[PDB]
Structures are given as structure tokens and as C-alpha cells.
């Protein structure tokens, strides 16, 4: 690219679009569960992964993965979601934060407690 060509047409930058468009550059977003269910993952990993179809406060319709060891999320549950795509699940790019408004903490966890919304064991 010669300098005269660059003067006539400047270099084009990458747009570099966002991975998580639903949060709209917010760290977390509150939603209500519209469908909690499970899904089989893509090859190679094979299990029954727990996801939930959520309607956010800005009207978007997303799918959010539920981590930890079992949940308590039912229909019309008010949860809080954060970014972070799950590799296996094709289409799930959000996590439910544990210890949220309705996402209760994972039972009997004494490591990664802050990640899974778990209080101190009283000892």
C-alpha cells in the first residue's frame, strides 16, 4: 500500500464486535426465567447440561448456563446473569451468578465458594 493510496483511502480498522451483545456493556443483567431445562452438548463432551431461557430487563431473550452442583431455579425465578461463553453448549454465552437474587448457593462447597455464592462454613 503506497502512501499516496493511503492518503486517498485511509487504513480501515477492525470493528471487533462484542461477544456478549445482550448485556449491552453492563457487567451483569437481571432476568426472569422463561424455561429451565437440560441439553446434550456437542462432541466430544457428553452430559446433561442445565440451561435456562431468560428474558432480560431490556427485552432480550437469551440462554444462560447454570453452574455448580444442582440448582433451585424454577419458572418465574428472578436471576442475575454475567458474561462468559460455555464451549460445549452451542448458543449459550451467559452464566447465572450463584448467590444471586434467587440463585441459591451451591450446597456443601468449601472451595471456590466466592465463585459459587457459598457462605463461610461456621468453624
Amino acid at each position: 500500500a503506497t502512501v499516496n493510496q493511503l492518503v486517498r483511502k485511509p487504513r480501515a480498522r477492525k470493528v471487533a464486535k462484542s461477544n456478549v451483545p445482550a448485556l449491552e456493556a453492563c457487567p451483569q443483567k437481571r432476568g426472569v426465567c422463561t424455561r429451565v431445562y437440560t441439553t446434550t452438548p456437542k462432541k466430544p463432551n457428553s452430559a446433561l447440561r442445565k440451561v435456562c431461557r431468560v428474558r432480560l430487563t431490556n427485552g432480550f431473550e437469551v440462554t444462560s448456563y447454570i453452574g455448580g452442583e444442582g440448582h433451585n431455579l424454577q419458572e418465574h425465578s428472578v436471576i442475575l446473569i454475567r458474561g462468559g461463553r460455555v464451549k460445549d453448549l452451542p448458543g449459550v454465552r451467559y452464566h447465572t451468578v450463584r448467590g444471586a437474587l434467587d440463585c441459591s448457593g451451591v450446597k456443601d462447597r468449601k472451595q471456590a465458594r466466592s465463585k459459587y455464592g457459598v457462605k463461610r462454613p461456621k468453624a
Binding site: T38, K43, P44, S46, L48
Partner: protein, 46 residues
């Protein structure tokens, strides 16, 4: 305990065979330690 989302949608003849022909009850591939699918590019701990 969460519901499974079957990919057959509205089942009107037989849901057991429907879940068979769903990917949930699929036949699964095992990575051989040696044999045919034997080669590992990188180890578990290397």
C-alpha cells in the same frame, strides 16, 4: 431435577423411541489408548 428438552418436539406416537432417535441416547465414541484411534498429539500432563 430439570426437564430434558427432546429434539422431536411434539411426540404423537412413541416418546421412548423418540428419545432413542433424539441425540440423548446416541451411540458414543471412545478414544482408544492404543489401537486404531491410538495417537495422542499431547499427553494429559504434558
Amino acid at each position: 431435577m430439570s426437564r430434558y428438552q427432546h429434539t422431536k418436539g411434539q411426540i404423537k406416537d412413541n416418546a421412548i423411541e423418540a428419545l432413542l432417535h433424539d441425540p440423548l441416547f446416541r451411540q458414543r465414541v471412545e478414544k482408544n489408548k492404543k489401537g486404531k484411534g491410538s495417537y495422542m498429539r499431547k499427553g494429559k500432563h504434558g
